[PDB]
């Protein structure tokens, strides 16, 4: 929502900023597509310091493009960009759940730790524990970080 709306300005719609890589993605041969997107995630952070609306556009469509790219499921950087996206969105239940259902971050501990941290701050301590154990049984690396955060999480909710 903002195509053709570009007025006299140094800045476009977030859509055009994203379309600058998309036009290049159409006929992209095979020099790793993630390496293109990461350049635009850093580019929007250096060119647009408080204009996060552009960054979020790149991030929400990043998880779409590499969603059914099933070899990027557990990529620590791709999941780290989902964690980067997370702090700008209040729908973290729907977000991290969607990732888990599509296999995104099943072998990534920082995914389960991030969601559990959100849920604790809401009062979803039992559901957050239920997320941390999902990591432990799925063997999400680092597994040791899941187990240490699990027991430290349990020693909190038993006292509350």
Task: Describe it.
- Residues 109-142 are annotated as: Necessary for interaction with KNL1.
- Interacts with BUB3 and KNL1. Interacts (when phosphorylated) with PLK1. The BUB1-BUB3 complex interacts with MAD1L1.
- Residues 11-156 are annotated as: Necessary for kinetochore localization.
- This protein is mainly alpha-helical and 160 residues long.
- It has a single domain, classed as Serine Threonine Protein Phosphatase 5, Tetratricopeptide repeat (Alpha Horseshoe), CATH 1.25.40.
- Helices cover 66% and strands 0% of the residues.
- The protein contains 8 helices and no strands.
- The protein has helices at 14-26, 34-47, 52-65, 76-86, 92-101, 109-122, 125-138, 143-157.
- Helix 1 (14-26) packs antiparallel against helix 2, helix 3 crosses helix 4 (76-86) and helix 6 (109-122) packs antiparallel against helix 7 (125-138).
- The longest helix is centred in the C-terminal third of the chain and has 15 residues, at 143-157.
- It is elongated.
- It starts with 13 loop residues before the first helix and ends with a helix.
- 24% of the residues are buried.
Give keywords:
Mitotic checkpoint serine/threonine-protein kinase BUB1; Serine Threonine Protein Phosphatase 5, Tetratricopeptide repeat; elongated; 8 helices; 160 residues; mainly alpha
**How many DSSP E strands?**
0
First-to-last CA distance: 46 Å
Helix content: 55-70%
The name CATH uses for the topology is Serine Threonine Protein Phosphatase 5, Tetratricopeptide repeat
Structural class: mainly alpha
Largest sheet: none
The geometry reads as: elongated
CATH architecture: Alpha Horseshoe
Beta-strand content bin: under 5%
Number of helices: 8
- The helix-strand sequence is HHHHHHHH
CATH class: Mainly Alpha
Oligomer: monomer
**In angstroms, what is the radius of gyration?**
18 Å
User: In the residues, how many domains can be counted?
Assistant: 1
């Amino acid at each position: 929502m903002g195509h053709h709306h570009h007025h006299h300005s140094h800045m476009d719609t977030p859509e055009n900023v994203l379309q600058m890589l998309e036009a290049h993605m159409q006929s992209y041969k095979g020099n790793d597509p993630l390496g293109e997107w990461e350049r635009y995630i850093q580019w929007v952070e250096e060119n647009f310091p408080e204009n996060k609306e552009y960054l979020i556009t790149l991030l929400e469509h990043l998880m779409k493009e590499f969603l059914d790219k099933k070899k990027y499921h557990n990529d620590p950087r791709f999941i780290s960009y989902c964690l980067k996206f997370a702090e700008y969105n209040s729908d973290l239940h729907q977000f991290f759940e969607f990732l888990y259902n599509h296999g995104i971050g099943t072998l990534s501990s920082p995914l389960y730790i991030a969601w559990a941290g959100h849920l604790e701050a809401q009062g979803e301590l039992q559901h957050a524990s239920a997320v941390l154990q999902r990591g432990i049984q799925n063997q999400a690396e680092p597994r040791e970080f899941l187990q240490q955060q699990y027991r430290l999480f349990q020693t909190r909710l038993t006292e509350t």
